[PDB]
C-alpha cells in the first residue's frame, strides 16, 4: 500500500489548508462565499485541533473539530466522523448543525 497510516495531513486541497490560521481563512472567506455555503476546513499536524470554517451570509464561522479519545474525528455540537473527509463530505451534504450546509471550498487555490 505504502500510504502512511493516519491521514498524513493531506494538505493538498483547497478547503483543506493545514497552514492557514483561522482568520487568514476567514479573510479568504471574505473573498469568496456570500452564497452561504462556502467553507474550508483546517487541520495542521503538530499539536492542537482542527476546525471547520464556513461563512453564512457575511459572518464567518468556525467549528472546533476533534475526536473523543476514540480516534475518530468529530464535533461537539456538530457530529461524529472518521476523518475530515467524512465530516466534510457529509457536511458537504448538509449542515448537520452548522449555520448552513456546505456548498463550496473557500480557501485559496494553489499556484495559478
Amino acid at each position: 500500500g505504502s500510504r502512511r497510516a493516519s491521514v498524513g495531513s493531506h494538505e493538498k486541497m483547497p478547503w483543506f489548508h493545514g497552514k492557514i490560521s483561522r482568520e487568514e481563512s476567514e479573510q479568504i472567506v471574505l473573498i469568496g462565499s456570500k452564497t452561504n455555503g462556502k467553507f474550508l476546513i483546517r487541520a495542521r499536524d503538530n499539536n492542537g485541533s482542527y476546525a471547520l470554517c464556513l461563512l453564512h451570509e457575511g459572518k464567518v464561522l468556525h467549528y472546533r473539530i476533534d475526536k473523543d479519545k476514540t480516534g475518530k474525528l468529530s464535533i461537539p455540537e456538530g457530529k461524529k466522523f472518521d476523518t475530515l473527509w467524512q465530516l466534510v463530505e457529509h457536511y458537504s451534504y448538509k449542515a448537520d448543525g452548522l449555520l448552513r450546509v456546505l456548498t463550496v471550498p473557500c480557501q485559496k487555490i494553489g499556484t495559478q
Binding site: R22, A51, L61, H62, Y63, R64, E77, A95, D96, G97
Partner: peptide, 5 residues
C-alpha cells in the same frame, strides 16, 4: 472562537 454547530 467556535460557532455552535
Amino acid at each position: 472562537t467556535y460557532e455552535t454547530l
